[PDB]
């Protein structure tokens, strides 16, 4: 078994390009659990590369808080998983180590795993680890989970510490958890759902207690399906699987409602205004001067400081940096960026207006005639081939941006959202979504119907 | 604004609801800056001008921008006070955290740099 | 002829620790070994995060009260982006859009300040808390010491109220005295604990700003030089222009993409902070 485990690990690694680094001695309250960690979360014991030339042999002096908490709970870390470089991408194809391949299919198929937590999802789908940690900025835990036919939970923003979680877009970045087992996932969430004073965005102890104090018995549970997300071209098999799930729920006595949340439609343009801007800002530190890759010869060229080193950024990262800097320049800032922030506020307000649970961050009262959970597709597409994904992206950025149509609103509003599979080994999923802070409801609901 | 409808009574109401003639988001979303603009942008980005395919960046940015510029037409609809004692208390309770490397000399701050000169970081003119 | 002059004064706070990290704010920077007083955050390591030092708020409160400034109900930090060896984050945190305080003034008198006017007040535009950068030593390779990076600064911006050069000296002197009297800074121009940029304009012409002034004598002289130099003019001084100083003459010399910091909480002070800090003020002159 042990021998059989290592051999399995070597095989799937070789065929599917899952890890960026593996424990030298693999498999040697979460005591005995084995985890993989997305390679944008810093660790003392492994390099943290962000799948980037920029940080190709970077060794952090410290463990991310989530890594420390896991270790303290007795978790063994198998290795760091491959990812889209610096978290930028939706397909898992942008990495200095090459793309991750989806293990639901023969590796010859070169099917995409989805991104940015590609390796994380793959390591779970292969049964290499008990759970994986990923990050989700616009869908990057939920989408690859969906494509690996495993659970992918993105908790409420600020519940899990981002200390040591390398910055992509800080107002959106969230640590998330992938597993095949809802029980394991809840245990991991409970372990990691903690205030961290190192993280100025960590949800305070006071607000956590306020959230708990707001919980009420809900009878019956009220579930919404969202008009604006109910009309996309969906994969073959989806409607049957979707309708079977809703029927199962209706036969349990819960109530299902149509709900319209018009602001969800503008979420992609909102996201690609805010997120590239933050990205450009957060990547301004990379210069090879204090750490990471550094050009052997020049710290400046063409009157542009750090250009030679920074040229080693991946191509998708450069594109986004360029866009983000455009978005931040004075005139564009006063227009698109300010507008995007205001619309984001509108979105949060619309969600507040339809949820019974109060939002402690906006001090909404909760709508007593509102809803407990939303159910929304995770993706409108099946995983294609790496070539097809790469071809499509080359045609237009919009073709890639649309991949996160269903996931970005919950990122923008920081809502807890769990993608769950509908059929064994099938890259189709649904999200269960609750109000900000209402993580236990989402998880218990999913556990209840599992 | 957001609105909740009446509860579904049966699965066929849901099938009919899902089959209503309503735009997809794809349908709703309908799935160039000067070369000098791009050059300025490369500079702000700390990216090299040499080797850069300008027209290609012009082209990609153009499409990026028309996508996010959809916001131009969207109308906009429409914290605990730190007090004195808490101010003083916070000041009194601040301390250096080893987990932050805040204690002087507790780690080699230059030890991750590819190049250095003794305890200094270095930049080449 | 009439001089309309304004100042931008950066002042290092002598808080025990730094602005967004609790690493030591050293008073012996000249003898310290380089890159010794530097946290993970000071070196801008991946995954590090800023946490505001509340002592900087206290110091800014004391300064605001002394100046008669209005403390902003909500203030925030913004990112000012540019690349430089002594700026490890690639941006400086500073209060651009929502400064700590606005308004205020400083009174000068003939009796006490050796001014020709019996009384003359210099208005303050705003007051900002911001990060210091590291120190660079040019030897070609430049050596960077980040001990000074993330040290708290307060930037004071005046209205263009200066008319005489005796006023500028008297203002700097009292401001130096003031910051020392409040125990928030050494106010020493020689060490760089205080740094003065100048903006001025003669007879409602274009505003010009003078940079790199190491000591009060050089500021006064640059002002005196620039005043007489400007009078002689005159198509070149129609648009704003930033100049320098060379001991004998003044010689000629970017979108910062200001973005509100997405991580740091707003500064939202309760009314009792005002009365509280007020009770802790030293007797003012
Ligand atoms: C994860 O999250 C990535 C989200 C989105 N595809 C992006 O590139 O920002």
What's the gap in Å between the CA of B85 and the closest CA on chain A? 18
Q: What percent of the residues of chain A are helix, what percent strand, and what percent coil, each to the nearest 5?
A: 40, 15, 45
What totals of helices (H) and strands (E) does chain B contain, helices first?
A: 5, 2
Query: Residue A375 forms beta bridges with which residues?
Result: A225, A432
Residue A4 host element (H or E) = helix A2-16
Query: Residue C126 forms beta bridges with which residues?
Result: C102, C157
Q: Are strands A174-179 and A417-421 parallel, antiparallel or unpaired?
A: unpaired
Q: Which two tokens stand for residue B96?
A: 């250096």
- The minimal CB distance from B84 to the residues C45, C145, C273 is found for C273
Whole-angstrom CA distances from B89 to A208, A220, B84, B112, C275 are: 22, 46, 8, 36, 16
Whole-angstrom CA distances from C121 to A17, A163, C1, C84, C97 are: 70, 48, 20, 38, 26
How crowded is the C-beta side of A167, counted as CA atoms within 13 Å?
29
Q: Provide, as residue numbers in chain B, all residues whose Cβ is less than 8 Å from the Cβ of A336.
A: 68-69, 71-72
Active-site annotation holds for A116: yes
Write down the architecture of domain A1-450 according to CATH. Alpha-Beta Complex (3.90)
**Ligand 1, residues A41, A116, A320: which to mutate, most atoms within 8 A of Cβ?**
A116
In this structure, chain B runs to a length of 125
Alpha helix stretches (DSSP H) within chain C: 54-67, 110-113, 165-181, 216-232, 271-279
Could you tell me which of A203, A254, A222, A23 has the C-alpha nearest to residue A129?
A: A23
Cα dihedral angle (A54, A412, A154, A349), rounded to 10 degrees? 160
Distance CA A175, CA A321 (A): 22
Query: Residue A222 forms beta bridges with which residues?
Result: A255
Q: Are strands C135-138 and C101-102 parallel, antiparallel or unpaired?
A: unpaired
**Ligand 1, residues A39, A89, A278: which to mutate, most atoms within 8 A of Cβ?**
A89
Domain-wise residue ranges, chain A: 1-450
Could you tell me which of C106, C29, C30 has the C-alpha nearest to residue C63?
A: C106
Cis amide bond preceding A116, omega within 30: yes
- Nearest Cα residue in chain A from C266: A200
Straight-line distance from the first to the last Cα atom of chain C, in angstroms, rounded to the nearest whole number: 33
Active-site annotation holds for A230: no
Could you tell me which of A85, A80, A110 has the C-alpha nearest to residue A96?
A: A85
Q: Which two tokens stand for residue C174?
A: 């009292």
Q: Which two tokens stand for residue A101?
A: 């391949």
Residue A199 host element (H or E) = none
Instruction: Indicate the number of domains in chain C.
Output: 1
| Contact present, A432 and A446 (Cβ < 8 Å) | yes
Q: Are strands A255-260 and A222-226 parallel, antiparallel or unpaired?
A: parallel
- Nearest Cα residue in chain C from B84: C273
Q: What percent of the residues of chain C are helix, what percent strand, and what percent coil, each to the nearest 5?
A: 20, 30, 50
Cα dihedral angle (A159, A165, A169, A170), rounded to 10 degrees? 50
Instruction: Tell me the three state secondary structure of residue A189.
Output: helix
DSSP states along C99-117: -SEE--EEEEEHHHH--SS
Inter-chain CB proximity B114 and A294 less than 8 Å: yes
Q: Provide, as residue numbers in chain A, all residues whose Cβ is less than 8 Å from the Cβ of B13.
A: none
The count of other CB atoms within 10 Å of the CB of residue B43 is: 19
Distance CA A82, CA A39 (A): 6
Distance CA A146, CA A235 (A): 13
* Greatest extent of chain C over all pairs of C-alpha atoms, in Å: 57
Ligand 1: distance of its center to the CA of A152 in Å?
A: 15
Using CB atoms, which chains have 3+ pairs under 8 A with C? A, B
Method: X-ray
Cα dihedral angle (C155, C157, C163, C166), rounded to 10 degrees? -20
Distance CA B113, CA A422 (A): 48
Residue in A398, A400, A405, A430 to test binding to B, most B beta-carbons within 10 Å: A398
**Candidate list A116, A169, A400, A417, residue with the active-site label:** A116
Active-site annotation holds for A38: yes
Distance CA C68, CA C127 (A): 11
Inter-chain CB proximity C259 and A284 less than 8 Å: no
Alpha helix stretches (DSSP H) within A99-251: 118-125, 142-147, 182-192, 205-213, 238-250
The count of other CB atoms within 10 Å of the CB of residue C234 is: 8
Distance CA A89, CA A95 (A): 10
Atom of ligand 1 nearest to the CA of A272: 9
Ligand 1: distance of its center to the CA of A140 in Å?
A: 6
Whole-angstrom CA distances from A102 to A7, A79, A125, A154 are: 19, 18, 9, 21
Broken C–N links (> 2.5 Å) in chain B, after residues? 31, 78
Inter-chain CB proximity C24 and B96 less than 8 Å: yes
Straight-line distance from the first to the last Cα atom of chain A, in angstroms, rounded to the nearest whole number: 28
DSSP states along C159-170: -S-B-SHHHHHH
Could you tell me which of C24, C19, C11, C18 has the C-alpha nearest to residue C188?
A: C11
- The minimal CB distance from B8 to the residues A256, A298, A305 is found for A256
Residue-number span of the structural domain to which C231 is assigned: 1-285
What's the gap in Å between the CA of C81 and the closest CA on chain A? 7
Q: Provide, as residue numbers in chain B, all residues whose Cβ is less than 8 Å from the Cβ of A61.
A: 101, 107, 112
Residue in B47, B92, B103, B123 to test binding to C, most C beta-carbons within 10 Å: B123
Could you tell me which of A232, A267, A274, A278 has the C-alpha nearest to residue A413?
A: A267
DSSP states along C78-104: EEEE---TT-TTSEEEE-SSS-SEE--
| Contact present, C119 and C108 (Cβ < 8 Å) | yes
Q: Provide, as residue numbers in chain C, all residues whose Cβ is less than 8 Å from the Cβ of B94.
A: 17, 22, 53-55
Query: Residue C221 forms beta bridges with which residues?
Result: none
Residues of A (187-246) whose Cβ lies below 8 Å from C: 197-201
| Contact present, C259 and C78 (Cβ < 8 Å) | yes
Distance CA A145, CA A18 (A): 14
Q: Are strands C141-145 and C135-138 parallel, antiparallel or unpaired?
A: antiparallel
| Contact present, A150 and A131 (Cβ < 8 Å) | no
Q: Which two tokens stand for residue C117?
A: 């006017």
Query: Residue C196 forms beta bridges with which residues?
Result: C9
- The minimal CB distance from B25 to the residues A62, A232, A353 is found for A232
Ligand 1: distance of its center to the CA of A90 in Å?
A: 6
């Amino acid at each position: 078994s042990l021998k059989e485990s290592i051999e399995r690990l070597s095989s799937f690694q070789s065929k599917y390009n899952i890890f960026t680094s593996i424990n030298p001695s693999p498999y040697s309250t979460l005591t005995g659990c084995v985890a993989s960690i997305k390679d944008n979360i810093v660790t003392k014991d492994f390099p943290t590369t962000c799948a980037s030339h920029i940080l190709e042999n970077f060794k952090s002096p410290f463990d991310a808080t989530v890594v420390k908490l896991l270790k303290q709970a007795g978790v063994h870390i198998l290795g760091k998983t491959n990812l889209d470089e610096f978290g930028m991408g939706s397909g898992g194809v942008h990495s200095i180590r090459g793309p991750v391949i989806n293990p639901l299919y023969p590796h010859e198929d070169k099917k995409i795993m989805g991104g940015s937590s590609s390796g994380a999802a793959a390591s779970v789908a292969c049964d290499l680890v008990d759970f994986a940690l990923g990050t989700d900025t616009g869908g990057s835990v939920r989408l690859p989970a969906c494509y690996g036919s495993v659970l992918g939970f993105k908790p409420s923003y600020g519940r899990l510490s981002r200390f040591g979680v390398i910055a992509y877009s800080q107002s959106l970045d969230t640590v998330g958890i992938l597993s095949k087992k809802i029980n394991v996932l809840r245990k991991v969430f409970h372990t990691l759902d903690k205030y961290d004073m190192k993280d100025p965005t960590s949800l305070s102890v006071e607000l956590r207690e306020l959230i708990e104090g707001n919980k009420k018995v809900r009878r019956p549970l009220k579930v919404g399906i969202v008009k604006e997300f109910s009309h996309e071209s969906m994969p073959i098999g989806f409607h049957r699987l979707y309708l079977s799930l809703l029927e199962k729920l209706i036969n349990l006595g819960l109530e299902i409602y149509p709900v319209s949340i018009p602001s969800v439609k503008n979420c992609l343009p909102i996201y690609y205004t805010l997120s590239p801007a933050e990205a450009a800002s957060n990547l301004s530190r990379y210069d090879g001067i204090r750490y990471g890759y550094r050009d052997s010869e020049l710290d400046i060229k063409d009157g542009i400081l750090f250009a030679p080193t920074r040229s080693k950024f991946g191509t998708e990262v450069k594109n986004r940096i360029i866009l983000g800097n455009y978005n931040l320049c004075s005139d564009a800032f006063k227009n698109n960026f300010i507008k995007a922030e205001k619309l984001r506020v509108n979105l949060i307000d619309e969600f507040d207006g339809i949820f019974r649970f109060p939002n402690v961050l906006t001090n909404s009262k909760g709508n007593p005639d509102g809803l407990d959970l939303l159910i929304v597709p995770t993706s409108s597409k099946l995983p294609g081939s790496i070539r097809d994904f790469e071809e499509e992206e080359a045609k237009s950025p919009a073709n890639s941006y649309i991949n996160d149509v269903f996931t970005v609103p919950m990122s923008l509003a920081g809502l807890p959202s769990l993608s769950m599979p509908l059929k064994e080994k099938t890259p189709i999923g649904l999200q269960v979504v609750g109000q900000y802070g209402d993580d236990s409801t989402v998880l218990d609901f999913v556990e209840s119907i599992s | 604004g957001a609105k909740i409808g009446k509860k579904f009574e049966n699965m066929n109401q849901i099938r009919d609801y899902l089959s209503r003639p309503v735009w997809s988001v794809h349908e709703y979303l309908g799935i160039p800056p000067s070369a000098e603009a791009v050059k300025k942008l490369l500079r702000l980005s700390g990216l090299p001008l040499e080797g850069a395919d300008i027209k290609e960046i012009q082209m990609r940015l153009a499409k990026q921008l028309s996508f996010i510029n959809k916001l131009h037409n969207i109308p906009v609809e429409g914290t605990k006070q730190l007090n004195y004692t808490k101010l003083l208390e916070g000041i009194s309770h601040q301390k250096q955290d080893a987990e932050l490397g805040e204690v002087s000399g507790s780690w080699k701050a230059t030890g991750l740099a590819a190049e250095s000169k003794n305890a200094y970081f270095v930049v080449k003119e | 002829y009439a001089l309309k002059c304004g100042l931008e004064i950066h002042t290092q706070l002598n808080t025990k620790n730094k602005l967004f990290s609790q690493s030591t704010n050293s008073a012996t920077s000249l003898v310290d070994a380089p890159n010794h007083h530097t946290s993970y955050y000071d070196i801008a390591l991946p995954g590090t995060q800023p946490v505001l030092n509340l002592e900087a708020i206290l110091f800014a409160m004391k300064l605001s009260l002394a100046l008669g400034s209005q403390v902003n109900s909500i203030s925030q930090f913004d990112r000012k982006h540019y690349f430089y060896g002594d700026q490890p984050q690639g941006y400086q945190l500073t209060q651009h859009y929502r400064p700590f305080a606005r308004g205020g003034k400083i009174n000068l008198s003939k009796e006490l300040d050796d001014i020709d006017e019996s009384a003359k007040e210099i208005g303050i535009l705003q007051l900002q808390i911001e990060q210091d950068t590291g120190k660079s030593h040019y030897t070609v390779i430049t050596l960077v010491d980040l001990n000074r990076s993330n040290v708290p600064l307060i930037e004071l911006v005046t209205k263009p109220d200066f008319s005489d050069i005796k006023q500028v000296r008297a203002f700097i002197k009292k401001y130096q005295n003031l910051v020392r009297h409040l125990h928030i800074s050494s106010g020493d121009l020689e060490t760089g604990a205080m740094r003065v940029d100048v903006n001025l304009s003669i007879n409602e012409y274009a505003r010009v700003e003078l940079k790199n002034l190491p000591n009060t004598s050089s500021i006064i002289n640059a002002i005196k030089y620039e005043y007489q130099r400007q009078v002689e003019l005159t198509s070149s001084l129609m648009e704003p222009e930033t100049r320098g100083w060379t001991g004998s003459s003044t010689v000629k010399l970017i979108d910062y993409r200001y973005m509100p910091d997405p991580e740091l909480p707003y500064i939202n002070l309760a009314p009792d902070v005002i009365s509280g800090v007020r009770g802790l003020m030293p007797q003012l002159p």
